[PDB]
């Protein structure tokens, strides 16, 4: 059957430098009546369709950018990405057409910038989720780098029903974002007055505190 | 301009079918093979089909994976292409998109759907509640898209004319409910001065709310 690999799974790079991708094929893409490789490669930014790049191994679709090259022939192909800019974070997927079409596994490409910190709001419960008898309380971690964060949950000054979820990296500022959820009964929530969580993260050896009282509400 | 447009998505029990739809324009359809491909949530794109062109007597051909299983078919006087699925499972769970494929000459999707997302599961459907989060020169709201099922759910503020500044936070299930938060970023000159609101819908519920972030 045809088996398409690629490599690597995942890398980082800076904005401007150069990015390279491979793609192997389990047997020659080389149709030998039209002499061309019936290899593709398309990009998917995050939440998107996959979107074409390149096809017959190097041929650049019509408004692709000048910085994507496709190359290689018969079993192995690349996929170079010179000066790489923060709009370029995607999965990239080859694929081949030789024989039906099947798609290689993607390589995801994510963009290396300087730390930055997070910027981290708290926000109580609404009335109209405590009259149903819940409490969640958020605190949104905005636009830090690298991507690990550590998040804490402390209900009158001790720790702690929590969600976490991470943002796709921006793809303007390369940054990542956060939203950690915490959530309690009414009853429970009624028994305690401060609600903070606490964010430590590399670009500083102080977390950053928000915090809300309830009785100040 | 050339667009594909997929339907159909949805919830469907264990066991049990469905069929999809993709509408097109904007290039001449019976010229066209169109293949449909899938996508498990943060996996890899995986082809299941194609319909050949006119040319080629409109035949199709199936990855292993699915045939006998799945049927593709076309509409040639409207420019729709379908995929029946049988007896789906858990695996069947994706983005399924429609692609246009060959012309006889080029190799290559040239286009593709924005996708519809199938969920094969026994958990029933469960609407959003929906809360509005409300607290520089700069201020951050949000609204809280608590306990719904299955995905997705489409999040905008002020019907799209707030974008930039915005993060949507991916859904997390727990406890057989997905939740998911969104926050928008805006100068404090302009809230709550002028009003922000998030649109959330839940096709599945067909569920359609405006949630005003009001000054606490
Ligand atoms: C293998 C069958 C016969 O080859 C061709 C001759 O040109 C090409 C066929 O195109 C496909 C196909 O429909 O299977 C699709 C195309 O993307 C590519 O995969 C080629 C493959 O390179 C073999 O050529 O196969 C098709 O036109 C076919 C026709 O149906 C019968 O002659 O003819
Ligand atoms: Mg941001
Ligand atoms: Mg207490
Ligand atoms: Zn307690």
């Known amino acids: 059957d045809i088996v398409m690999s690629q490599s690597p799974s995942s890398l980082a790079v800076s904005a401007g430098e150069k990015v390279t991708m491979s793609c192997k094929s389990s047997?020659?893409?080389?149709?030998?009546?039209?002499?061309?490789?019936?290899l593709a490669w398309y990009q998917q930014k995050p939440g998107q369709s996959p979107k074409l790049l390149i096809y017959?191994?190097?041929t650049r679709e019509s408004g692709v950018p000048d910085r994507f090259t496709g190359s290689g022939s018969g079993t192995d192909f690349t996929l170079t990405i010179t000066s790489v800019q923060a709009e370029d974070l995607a999965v990239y997927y080859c694929?081949?057409?030789?024989?039906?079409?099947?798609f290689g596994g993607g390589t995801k490409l994510e963009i290396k910038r300087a730390d930055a910190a997070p910027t981290v709001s708290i926000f109580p419960p609404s009335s109209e989720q405590l009259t149903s008898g819940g409490a969640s309380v958020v605190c949104f971690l905005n636009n830090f780098y690298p991507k690990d964060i550590n998040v804490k949950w402390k209900i009158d000054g001790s720790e702690r029903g929590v969600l976490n979820s991470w943002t796709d990296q921006d793809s303007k500022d390369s940054t990542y974002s956060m939203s950690s959820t915490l959530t309690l009964t009414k009853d429970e929530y009624e028994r305690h007055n401060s609600y903070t969580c606490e964010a430590t993260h590399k670009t500083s050896t102080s977390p950053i505190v928000k915090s809300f009282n309830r009785n100040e509400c | 301009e050339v667009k594909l447009v997929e339907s159909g998505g949805g919830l469907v029990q264990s066991g049990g079918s469905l069929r999809l739809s993709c509408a097109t324009s904007?290039?001449?359809?019976?010229?066209?093979?169109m293949s449909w491909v899938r996508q498990p949530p943060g996996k890899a794109l995986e082809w299941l089909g194609f319909?050949?062109?006119?040319?080629?007597?409109?035949?199709?051909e199936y990855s292993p994976s699915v045939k006998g299983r799945f049927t593709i078919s076309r509409d040639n006087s409207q420019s729709i292409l379908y995929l029946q699925m049988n007896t789906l499972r858990a695996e069947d769970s994706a983005t399924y998109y429609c692609?246009?494929?060959?012309?006889?000459?080029?190799?290559?999707?040239?286009?593709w759907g924005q996708g519809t997302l199938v969920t094969v599961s026994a958990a029933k459907t469960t609407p959003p509640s929906v809360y509005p989060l409300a607290p520089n020169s700069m201020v951050t709201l949000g609204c809280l898209v608590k306990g719904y099922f299955p995905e997705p759910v489409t999040v905008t503020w002020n019907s799209g004319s707030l974008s930039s500044g915005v993060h949507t936070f991916p859904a997390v299930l727990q406890s057989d409910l997905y939740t998911l938060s969104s926050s928008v970023t805006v100068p404090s000159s302009t809230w709550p001065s002028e009003t922000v609101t998030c649109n959330v819908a839940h096709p599945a519920s067909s569920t359609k709310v405006d949630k005003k972030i009001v000054p606490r």
């Open positions: 692609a246009r494929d060959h012309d006889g000459y080029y190799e290559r999707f040239s286009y």
């Open positions: 904007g290039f001449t359809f019976t010229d066209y093979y």
């Open positions: 319909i050949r062109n006119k040319a080629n007597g409109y035949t199709t």
């Open positions: 047997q020659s893409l080389l149709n030998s009546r039209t002499r061309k490789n019936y």
């Open positions: 017959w191994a190097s």
């Open positions: 694929k081949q057409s030789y024989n039906l079409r099947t």
